[PDB]
Design a protein around this ligand. Structure first.
Ligand SMILES: [Co+2]
Length: 199
């Protein structure tokens, strides 16, 4: 499935498809943008069946409900919610449009890449482990982005040799999404990604 949204400050696209033959998706996402800010999150539950979904879905719900909190506060609520559950890998991103500032916090193998028109990228390494309900030492990144920056957040079901190149070349989130098409046809795992193009 594909969901697109747009306002004066951002255009986004969410894509999600299940593993081939698999009824219950283990990945979840949440995204909301208004005229002032964006919140979004992508998670991949551990385990399988309903139990993977229960973990990543809990993240989706908490991010929606606590969207006004800082990313580190939100991700700690998610961690707490994992206590008697499978757990999940997850990434949370907030953007304030007027300041062109983003904040980001993640644990596990959900990746985030932000490409700037100047040619610099923010492309953090994955933090080992996952959100299990045990204590974590979070790393929050805060940075300014330039107009024209394009980003993706994706689960491990998307495996792309040179993700930066697709962000650089694409001139719209629809084009980038189309640019990634060959990596979505196998469906070896659930595949979720959120793309954004920032004004
Ligand atoms: Co996965």
């Amino acid at each position: 499935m594909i969901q697109v949204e747009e306002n004066e400050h951002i255009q986004t696209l969410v894509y999600q498809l299940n593993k081939e033959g698999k009824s219950i998706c283990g990945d979840s996402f949440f995204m909301k943008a208004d005229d002032k800010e964006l919140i979004c999150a992508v998670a991949d539950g551990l385990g399988s069946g309903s139990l993977a979904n229960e973990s990543s879905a809990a993240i989706k719900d908490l991010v929606e409900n606590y969207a006004s909190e800082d990313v580190e506060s939100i991700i700690e609520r998610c961690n707490q919610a994992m206590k008697n559950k499978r757990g999940a890998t997850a990434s949370i991103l907030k953007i304030n449009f007027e300041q062109r500032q983003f904040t980001y916090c993640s644990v596990g193998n959900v990746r985030f890449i932000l490409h700037s028109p100047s040619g610099e990228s923010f492309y953090p390494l994955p933090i080992s482990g996952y959100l299990s309900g045990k204590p974590q030492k979070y790393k929050t990144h805060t940075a300014t982005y330039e107009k024209g920056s394009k980003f993706i957040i994706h689960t491990d079901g998307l495996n792309v040799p040179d993700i930066r190149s697709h962000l650089k070349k694409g001139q719209s989130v629809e084009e980038i999404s189309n640019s990634l098409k060959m990596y979505t046809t196998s469906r070896k795992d659930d595949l979720t990604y959120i793309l954004g193009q920032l004004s």
